[PDB]
Structures are given as C-alpha cells and as structure tokens.
Write a protein that binds this ligand. Sequence first.
Ligand SMILES: C(#C[C@@H]1CCCN1)c1cccnc1
Ligand SMILES: C(#C[C@@H]1CCCN1)c1cccnc1
Ligand SMILES: C(#C[C@@H]1CCCN1)c1cccnc1
Ligand SMILES: C(#C[C@@H]1CCCN1)c1cccnc1
Ligand SMILES: C(#C[C@@H]1CCCN1)c1cccnc1
Lengths: 203, 209, 206, 211, 204
Amino acid sequence: DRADILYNIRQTSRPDVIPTQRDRPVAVSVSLKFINILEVNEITNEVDVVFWQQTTWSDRTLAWNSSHSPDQVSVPISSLWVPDLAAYNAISKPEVLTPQLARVVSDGEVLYMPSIRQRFSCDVSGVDTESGATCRIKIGSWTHHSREISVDPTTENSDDSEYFSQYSRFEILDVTQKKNSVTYSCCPEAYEDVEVSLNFRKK
Amino acid sequence: DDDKLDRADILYNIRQTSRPDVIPTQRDRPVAVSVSLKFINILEVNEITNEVDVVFWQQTTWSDRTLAWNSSHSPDQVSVPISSLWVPDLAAYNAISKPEVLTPQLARVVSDGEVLYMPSIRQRFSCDVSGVDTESGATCRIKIGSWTHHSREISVDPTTENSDDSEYFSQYSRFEILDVTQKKNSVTYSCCPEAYEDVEVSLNFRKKG
Amino acid sequence: KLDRADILYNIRQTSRPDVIPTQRDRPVAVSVSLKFINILEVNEITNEVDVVFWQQTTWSDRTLAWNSSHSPDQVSVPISSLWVPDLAAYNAISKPEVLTPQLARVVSDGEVLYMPSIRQRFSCDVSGVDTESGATCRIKIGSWTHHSREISVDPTTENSDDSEYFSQYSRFEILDVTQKKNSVTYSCCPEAYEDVEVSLNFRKKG
Amino acid sequence: DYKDDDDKLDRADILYNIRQTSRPDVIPTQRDRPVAVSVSLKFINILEVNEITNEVDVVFWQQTTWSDRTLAWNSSHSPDQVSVPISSLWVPDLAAYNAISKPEVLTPQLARVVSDGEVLYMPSIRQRFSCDVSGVDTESGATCRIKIGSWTHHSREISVDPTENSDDSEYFSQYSRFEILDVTQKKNSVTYSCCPEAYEDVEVSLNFRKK
Amino acid sequence: LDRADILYNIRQTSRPDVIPTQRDRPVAVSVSLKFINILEVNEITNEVDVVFWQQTTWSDRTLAWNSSHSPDQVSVPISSLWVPDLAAYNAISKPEVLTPQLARVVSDGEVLYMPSIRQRFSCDVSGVDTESGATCRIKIGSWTHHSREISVDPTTENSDDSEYFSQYSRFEILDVTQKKNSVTYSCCPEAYEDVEVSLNFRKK
Ligand SMILES: C(#C[C@@H]1CCCN1)c1cccnc1
Ligand SMILES: C(#C[C@@H]1CCCN1)c1cccnc1
Ligand SMILES: C(#C[C@@H]1CCCN1)c1cccnc1
Ligand SMILES: C(#C[C@@H]1CCCN1)c1cccnc1
Ligand SMILES: C(#C[C@@H]1CCCN1)c1cccnc1
C-alpha cells in the first residue's frame, strides 16, 4: 500500500514546477522554531542559530483516497517540489541536520520540517541587557514573486519555551513572525517574506 | 558463506525486493528499531556553552522479513550498501552539527531478514556539561528517534539500558565514563501532535584526575 | 500549471547546458553586477577580505523564447537545465559558496536571469580601511575559459554606494562601488578575456 | 608484455572486460576462502600532535592489495596493468577503529588492476586518531597505535595481513616537526559484545618523537 | 549548431577512463604552475598554503576535427574527457579547485586544462624572512601511471611569475624553477615522472 502511494506520487510529482491551482499563488506556510543560539558576536553583529523550519504547502494533484489506506507517507524531498526559500540576511549556507524527508498527506498537503543550523547578520546590540537583543531574519522565495508564491507565518507570537534548549547560555524573550514584502531595483517584482524577530538575552 | 555466486545472488534478491524509500511495515504494525549507542570518545567539552563533541557506534537493527532467504546451503549474511536498503530516518533532537559518518556505509542483512547497521559517528550536541570537572561528573542527555515517523510507524527499543561502556570507550580519552543509561521516551510538540518514540541516552562522565 | 510544465519541457528540449548560446558568430553578451550585502572579515596584514554579494547575472538565449500571449511570462528553472556562463573571480582565494537556491528565471523573450547570493574570500588591497578615505578592494570577474570572441561581459550599474543592499549591521560601510569593463591576457593564455572590474571602496565604521 | 602496454585499444578492451566481470558490492571470495587483503601504511607526515587530548593528525599512503582472479587476462601480447576508477571495483571496507575524523583522500581514486587479477590501491590519506601521545617529547618517544580492518566482514570473509618493520625513511617528510623512530605493523583480532564474530585487523604501531 | 556538433563528436570518441596513448608512446603531459598567492607560511611546522593556476596540456588526436569552417576550440566539461591523474607528492590537504571544471579542446586534438587550485604543502620554509628567502619544493606527477604510460614536461623552467602573482601578498616571489624529475619508491617498482617546482620566495 505504501509503495503504491509512493509510486503514485512519483508518477504525478513535478519537482521543478510550482504546484499552482487555477493560476493562483502557492500558499507556503512557514514558522521557525528556535532550538538553540550557539554563538553571538556583539562586535560583528552575527549570530549562529539552530531552528526547525516548519514548512507546509499543498499540491492537490498528489492527493489520494485514504478511506482504506495510509493517509500519510514519508517521501524524499528529491521526489517533490519544495519552495525555494532563502534568508535575505544569511551569511552561511543552511546546514540541514536532519533526514531530508517530507510527509505527504492524502489530501495533498506536504509537510517539511528540517532542523537547520545557519549564521545571520543582524542586530545583536543589547544582548547582555534585560530587554535583550532583537535579531531579525527575513525568509522568502528567492526567485518566485508574490503572484507565484505567497509566504504566510503560522504562529505570529511565541516565547518558544516548548522548543528552545534549556542548556543554551541565552534565553528567548519573544519571537514574532510577521508577513513582510521586499522589492529591490535589481528585481522589479514584489517578493513576500516572513520577518522573524528573535528577541533574546544572555542568561 | 564464501560461495561467491551465492552472495551475488543474495544481493540481487535483496535489491529486487528492497524498497529503500518505503518502511517495511506489515499489516499496519510499527517497524521495531533497536538502538544502542556505544561511546568511543569524548573529544571536546565546553562547560560555558554546554556543548560536547563525541564519537559513538550507533548499533541499529530492525527486520524486513521480505528480505529473508533459506540459508541451509548458502551464506547466512551479506554486507549491503545502505543505499540499497530502507534505513530508519533517525536523528538526535539536540544535535548541533551534522552526523559525520566515519565508517563504510554498509549494513549486514541476515538470512532471517534482520538488518544490522552500525556506523561510527562523530557529532556535536547541546546538553548539560555542568559538573564535568567534579567527582560526580556531568550528565549529558541525547534523544534519538525517527524524524518523520510517529509511534504507529516506528518504535524505538533500547537494547542495553545500563552500562559503563568500559568495553568500548577509549582509554586515551581526557575523560572517563561513569555511567550510560539508555531508556525509552517519547516526544510530542505543538507543531507535530503525533507521539514520536526515541531512545534517551544519558551520558554521565567526568574529566580524569 | 501544465502550461508551466510545458514551458520547462520546451526549455529542456532546446537547452544545451554545455554549449554557449552564440547567435550569428557573435559573443554571448553577459551582464554582471555585484550587489554587496556584507563584509564579514577584513585583514590588513594579509590583505584578505570575506564578503557576501548578490551576483546579478543576465544573458539571452533566443532559442528558449516562447509566445507568452496566453501563458506565463517567466518560470524558474534549475541551472543544471541551462547553459550558464563559467564566471570566476581572478583574485578569489576560496571557492564561491552559493547561499541561495540554484534556480534561474527564464523570460519568454529568451532572457535568462541568475542571481546567487555568494560568500567568498579575495586577495585585494585592504590598506586604508581604518581611515576616512577607506580601502579600495578590486575584484575581477569574467569567463574562465571563453575569450572575448565567445563571451563579452558588461557591467550594468557602473557607480553606486550600494545603500539599497548593504547590511546596516556590518561593522563596515560602503563609500562607493564602481564596476567597469576590463580585459586581460597572459602568456599562458594568448586570447583577450573580458571581465568586470569591481572596485569596492569601504571603511570601518566609527 | 612491455611492448603492448601503450596499445590504447587493448587498454580500453581490458577496462571493458573488468567492468563486465567486476561485482563492486560482492566480496571476491575464491574456493570458499576469505579474501586475503594486505595493508601497509607508509607515513608521510605527522601534522599535529596533542599530548593533552592524546590526538594525532597524520598523512599516510595506505598500500592495499588483494586479488580477484576473475579479472585476470592473458597479457602475452597486451598491457600488463591498467588504472581503474575504484567505483568500478570491489574494494575492502577498511576502517580505523580509533579514527576520530573521516579519512580525507588526497589523491585520485584510481586503482591498478594487474593481468593476474591482483588489485593495487594506494590512496594518500589525511586522518586524525585517538592514541597514546605520551612521551612524544622524550628520546624513547611516543607510540601511537592505529587499528585498521574490515568494518563489516568477519575473519571468515576477509583476512588482513601486514605487508612489518621500517623507519619509513623513504617516505617520511624530512621537513616534519617530528621524526619516526619505528613503524611496526602486526596481525591482530578484535571482538566486541555487540558483534559476536572475530574481525581481523592490522595494528600499526607508530613510534615517533618531536625533533 | 557547429559547437553542439563538435561536443557530440568529442563525446562519441572520448574515452574518459583510458590514457590516450598514441603510437605506443607515453602520453606527453605538460605541466606548469603559475603562482597567484602565498596565503600562509609556518616556519615552525614547515607548511605553506598557496594558490596557483595549474596549466596542463596534452594531446588526443582522436578528438581532432577539420576547423576550416567551424570553431578552432570549444570548452568541454572535464567529466567528458580523460584528464591526467596528477597529484602533489607533498600535499597535506585536498586540492581545492576554485574555478569552473572545464577544459579547452583544440581542433588539432590538444586539450588545455588550467584550474586555479588552493592547496597546502609540506616543504622547507626556512629562510623565508631573509634576503635569499625560502625554497619550497613541490613535486607533481601522475599518481598511478608510471613513465612508460605518462611523461611530464615543464613549459617554463625559470620565471619570477610577475604576470600572475598577487601584488597584495605578504610575500614576494624571487624565482620559480620547474624541472623534469622521476621518483621511485620501494612500494612501486617503476619510475614515475614528475615536475619538480622550486618556489623561492620571501616575506616582504
Ligand atoms: C529575485 C529576487 C528577489 C529579490 C532578491 C531575492 N529575491 C531574482 C530574480 C531573478 C533571478 N533570481 C532571483
Ligand atoms: C515531525 C516531528 C516530530 C518532532 C521532530 C521529530 N518528531 C515532522 C513532521 C512533518 C515533517 N517532518 C517532521
Ligand atoms: C584561460 C584563461 C584566462 C586567463 C585565466 C582565466 N581566463 C584558460 C585557457 C585554457 C583552459 N582554461 C583556461
Ligand atoms: C561489525 C563489526 C566489527 C566489530 C566492530 C567494528 N567491526 C558490524 C556488524 C554489523 C553491522 N556493521 C558492523
Ligand atoms: C603508485 C605510485 C607512484 C608512487 C606513489 C605515487 N605514484 C601506485 C601504484 C598502485 C596504485 N596506486 C598508486
């Protein structure tokens, strides 16, 4: 049964084509769950963090009738289209720490949540104060403009207490995740991003 | 065992039957994955940042009975590249570096369908390093389980709950192991409401005096 | 969506990733413009810099063009499906690290747009970086193997302080970035090779 | 034979034959006997030594040989040897039991296949190990032991044999910070409670000191 | 279309894993390093970190074509070609290739391959801080093909590399000599050819 679902997905999946339905934007939901803050440099304004990037979207062409079969399977992301997300202020490659598999649900939803370690250029001033530093990370589709891909945050506000390591030397005060849009003279179109504002301080 | 043509044929059979991307479940039962870490070394410890850099053998076994063959007159086991096999998608929940596999990526397939895979892995973790310079030592806990398969699909079974690991740990390390416990645990999160099984590995160690 | 899959199919039937898309014995005209985002490390002793930049790169392959009167005007395409110019920095001292998805945009008129974010280290003049007038670090980028009859390189934005792109959190600030056509020839390699010479004039803040 | 060694078409046909016959994932056991693998490390350099952590960072040529007689051909009027990418060949799954880094292969991953079926593979490798560095600053020096054998094949499938005493002076960099006093390489066997079979290894004892 | 056809021809005739011996002679490989930079130098450990262009040429006449009315050269991914299995005998890191892995193929069958490489070596760094400078020697040749199969020739035996060497290095090149040499080790009962590169340099 599971082999048959994987076969179906592979027959139907077009890994290089955005799964647009009726010419509508593909809605990509994104939420960073911070796990650790490993290194912070107040002189260079850089941070080194680990987060789970909870990512979901739909490709209805993948759906199947699961009334008498599995309603989810794990799938190598190499078999799937996946959004071309990138952080605008990353200064290192995203290092994926976990198996590169997504879940496909029988209604066509795709769930992908890598643990990623990555370095960013952001405002680290105030990290050793009670009110803390606020490091902003902007994440969006690198090449698809707003007509093609829309990015939506899932949880606008959280202290992340469920996910964050208790052994970090930093503690998280608040994480806000809000829709935002960028445009540059290089690239006329509007591009959606989620702006992740990480408010943290040294313990 | 050393009948070459027999081995080539067994490998051919395994490749015909094996489906590397499909969990080898039967009748909607979870795949039971047994896990035991054998610590070989503790390379770096930072008590300020609560990080450790360690080397361990991850003894992992499970069954896929469709792989089985009659070995009354043929090899009992063969080595097989893991790229030809389904392998559980295990990950450490508090890892802060990629697992660095130090050994050839081969598993053993046994004629009863058991698969045995035991990579030597170097990896860094965020865990409690406080006390490492005391008699009582630090206790660093590491949780390992399937990243994407919940408890109805994969279960994780420890095989060696309690040990001092004296058989495996390097005598030349800066550190010594006091106790290692490996126990069943499960996690659940708001993001992912299913239950996920793991083995919780508690490494009690200290700097040698 | 089937329109988009069809476009990707057409591109792949027509694309020859290993063949330069010359038209009528003309060089392939490649436009290149570096948008600096950050300056991460500078060493005045060794004269080395570690920088992040978006490499805005464009060119045309008119064989890829399609009538888009009733279909998408552009699609994203993995660069492995396309010919891409073999650009390299002549004074790079590390591999270019691409920090972004390796996708290009293909426009229905046959224009290809590729803009990776790259982190890379260079040997250049860092002297004067702690002064008001700053350092001027020059970076030369051109085709590694194709000479000027085969690829030409043109800068698109010859002068800018780059304020739109540069990180406000860097400990450095950019005074000016100039980008100009240049060509080089060595006795090893007796053709003229075109490049863009990028002059990054920057200084430490404060 | 010598006169035909550079006959290109012959070399191409030999490569074809090898790829037709080779089974890269199957141990080339003959006569229900273990595959005899010979291993000899030629130390080229000792790059870093830590007395506190008991770690070394070394470069060595790992001279490795075995036979697969199904690859043999008649070289009376053809090349005696060709270079072959190791991806076309079975290679022993050797690993160092006390390695703490991946083996970094510094050379092209090509082996030689000889017309009698012998395979010769000799990568230059940079790797770090956990071993006894105590005494490195003394005249007697330190003795660092490296144990290398098949990771997954037990003694009935693969045996390992040292190719056993040298100062490696032919190979070792005259410019190193250290000097080699002696290198002995001896057959050995290990077994662990995880893994009930016996596994063969070569134990390489590197006696070295700071200059 | 002409270039696509030349690439198809090269791929039809190229044997990427077979040495292109012509007329039962060794493949004559020319090798010349152009030093671009000297990045780090350690007088205690006798190690250097350098960047060089490795100009490498050889012939495979089976790749030739009539270029009377077609391009004289094309760029080709080296994965489509045989390339000599060159290695440095005293390298202590992997060669890091900094440039696109393409070679030029000339219509007379000459192949030209010149990667920029960053690599670290074990060599004599003594005297680097003196007027006479250090002399770091680097030997590069085929790893697995002995002299009957591959020969290696230097192209410029003497030069100060002023065309190539970075103006902004902390070091300067006094002289670069590149000569034919052969090595024989007890492990391996044949002679292997190499280019011995002597890099005489000093701190500024
Ligand atoms: C773009 C864009 C937006 C703005 C910069 C990052 N995402 C683009 C255009 C063409 C090719 N690649 C990327
Ligand atoms: C999950 C999960 C829990 C939390 C990490 C592992 N178990 C998940 C869900 C969907 C896709 N990838 C991972
Ligand atoms: C060349 C060149 C010029 C000079 C270095 C980069 N562009 C070349 C020739 C043959 C093979 N590879 C590169
Ligand atoms: C083994 C073994 C020997 C003893 C430990 C290392 N080599 C083994 C068994 C099953 C799977 N992988 C490795
Ligand atoms: C050899 C050789 C010479 C001496 C070391 C480098 N080149 C060789 C023989 C068999 C397999 N691999 C390398």
